[PDB]
């Protein structure tokens, strides 16, 4: 009998031997002794292990005193105290120092032929002169800046130049309504705000100032409001408030000094929806954060400088914040921005994009995948010759979609790589290392250095310990990218992160660790639920079901569902605009009972 059915006769894949062939450079790892090996010191002594990986990985201004301070338990952990550093000069002021002409940026617009490519050096004036921009309209260390910006090059100018003054980004994903955008807004008390004059995504418009506006007249003390022309349409402008981003850039230098941050001050807050009611600022500090970045985009992704990394998630969640923007700029190789979807023109897209770029790791959630696999293997016929990792997140990959990514994709020629981590972790947890580590379909694999994951009762919270086993996983230590607090509300961090199994970080997931000591990623225990690659509160959707006059208690289950109790087909169609008007229409659910 198998406690982890799962795994029941699924045997590990090795890396294929051609990926070995075909590589441009020498790996980072001999190997999995290497892996162990640097593993058991992460976890034995984190103190040696991390100090030597953030000074490998990370320029600082000031070296730190200590590795870390704090305990689970307390909540008060610190990583690189006495350090200074600024992110801005980690993803761009080295780089081009060393080499001003390589791409940072690889721009990929909306329709196929447009976009652009960017330099080091190119994103430094850019990051520079809108940091001026920010500076001269009173933004200061510490402020909090709200970024609705769709995947364009001027949203990683945005986070970075926010970075670089030492502001904290405040990202909100471009499809939230204004009531979301709102929310996000006041509770990040945020005074300035940088958004598009429309977005424009698979041919469509996105009217992106409208929505500002209406949030704004909710917001006050908001008193400047950045207007990238991304399509040139007429929108509705407020003299005194508003400001037009070509305007305002050619005024100042193309050059400014960066604040000097300490390891733990603020980077950014990141906005995401949990169990239990409004949505949590998720705070990441700066240090720890870069670093975890930097190693899991070395390790995991086998990032080297000359690469070209394509994440296909969105800079309005941790994916896009930690893979498209901080990893890969950190590491110095080049980042692909991706306007478009999977679909436009036509379900080639992703292909095409990679063949044009000779990207060498591409990264989606199996959402995607699952469309492309039903759209038809015809779709895809391109040679891709430098495509060597194919990264997997935010669900478990099922044996059939993860066949179809190796053969039909992947031509038996890339590692796929099964990455399980959250908001709150800021970086891959439990992972194979590309080009390393042995893989099962289904599997996370192994945990990323530095994460000591366990498996507990769920009742009893006790530890279960060996391999077959099966319940709620936490991590037994810190690690340098775990998010510091919930903005505004510590308390709310404690009790949900840290209060529940004390001593432990709890995941809100439950895991199975085979026979051999591989895991199993089983979903969410608790009232969140992934539908097509959001994480979305059932409660959320409840509470905005039930703001309309005619419904009275609401449940919502998971493709989420809502059975409410109150023409009725009427009526039905009616709470659709209510969940519109309060989330987006991401959340709207597939069906609707009474
Ligand atoms: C990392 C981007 C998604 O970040 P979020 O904070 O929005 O969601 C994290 C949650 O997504 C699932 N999840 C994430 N990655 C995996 C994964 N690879 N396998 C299974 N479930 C996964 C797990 O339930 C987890 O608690
Ligand atoms: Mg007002």
């Given at each position: 009998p198998p406690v982890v059915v799962e795994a029941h006769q699924v045997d590990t894949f090795d890396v294929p031997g051609v990926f070995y062939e075909n590589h441009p450079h020498e790996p980072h790892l001999s190997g999995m002794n290497e892996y162990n090996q640097l593993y058991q010191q992460s976890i034995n002594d984190p103190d040696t292990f991390w100090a030597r990986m953030a000074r490998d990985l990370i320029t600082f201004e000031k070296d730190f005193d200590k590795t870390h301070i704090g305990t689970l338990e307390g909540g008060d952990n610190a990583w690189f105290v006495g350090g200074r550093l600024n992110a801005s000069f980690n993803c761009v002021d080295r780089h081009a120092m060393r080499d001003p002409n390589k791409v940072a940026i690889i721009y990929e617009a909306d329709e196929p032929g447009h976009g652009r490519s960017i330099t080091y050096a190119e994103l430094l004036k850019e990051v520079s002169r809108l940091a001026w921009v920010m500076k001269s309209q009173g933004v200061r260390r510490g402020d909090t800046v709200a970024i609705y910006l769709p995947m364009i090059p001027e949203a990683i100018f945005a986070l970075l130049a926010c970075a670089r003054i030492g502001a904290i980004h405040s990202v909100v994903?471009?499809?939230?309504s204004s009531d979301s955008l709102r929310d996000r807004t006041l509770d990040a008390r945020s005074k300035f705000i940088i958004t598009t004059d429309e977005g424009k995504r698979g041919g469509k418009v996105i009217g992106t100032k409208k929505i500002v506006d209406e949030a704004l007249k909710q917001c006050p003390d908001v008193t400047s409001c950045l207007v990238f022309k991304r399509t040139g349409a007429d929108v509705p402008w407020t003299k005194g408030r508003d400001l037009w981003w070509h305007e305002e850039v050619e005024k100042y230098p193309n050059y400014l000094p960066a604040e000097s941050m300490d390891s733990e001050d603020p980077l950014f807050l990141l906005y995401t929806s949990g169990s239990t009611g409004k949505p949590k600022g998720v705070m990441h500090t700066t240090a720890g954060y870069l670093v975890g970045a930097a190693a899991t985009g070395k390790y995991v992704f086998d990032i080297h400088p000359a690469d070209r990394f394509f994440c296909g998630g969105d800079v309005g969640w941790i994916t896009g914040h930690t893979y498209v923007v901080y990893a890969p700029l950190l590491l110095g190789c080049t980042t692909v921005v991706f306007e478009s979807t999977p679909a436009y023109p036509n379900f080639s897209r992703y292909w095409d994009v990679i063949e044009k770029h000779k990207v060498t790791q591409f990264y989606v959630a199996p959402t995607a995948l699952r469309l492309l696999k039903r759209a038809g293997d015809h779709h895809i016929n391109h040679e891709?010759?430098?495509?060597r990792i194919l990264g997997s997140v935010g669900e478990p990959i099922a044996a059939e979609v993860w066949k179809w990514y190796h053969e039909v994709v992947g031509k038996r020629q890339a590692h796929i790589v099964d990455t399980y981590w959250q908001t709150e972790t800021g970086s891959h947890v439990i992972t194979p290392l590309g080009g390393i580590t042995p893989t099962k379909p289904g599997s996370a694999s192994l945990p990323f250095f530095g994460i000591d994951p366990v498996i507990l009762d769920?009742?009893?919270?006790a530890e279960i310990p060996g391999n077959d086993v099966e319940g709620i996983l936490a991590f037994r230590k810190p690690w340098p990218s775990m998010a510091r607090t919930v903005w505004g509300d510590h308390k709310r961090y404690m009790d949900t992160?840290?209060?529940?199994?004390?001593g432990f970080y709890f995941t809100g997931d439950g895991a199975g660790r085979d026979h051999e000591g591989y895991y199993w990623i089983r979903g969410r225990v608790d009232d969140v639920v992934n539908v097509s690659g959001h994480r979305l509160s059932t409660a959320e959707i409840e509470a905005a079901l039930i703001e309309?006059?005619?419904?009275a208690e609401a449940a919502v289950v998971g493709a989420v569902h809502a059975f409410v109790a109150l023409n009725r087909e009427q009526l039905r169609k009616e709470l659709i605009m209510q969940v519109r008007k309060s989330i987006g229409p991401f959340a709207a659910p597939k069906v609707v009972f009474v």
């Open positions: 994903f471009a499809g939230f891709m010759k430098d495509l769920p009742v009893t919270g992160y840290l209060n529940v199994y004390k309309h006059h005619c419904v």
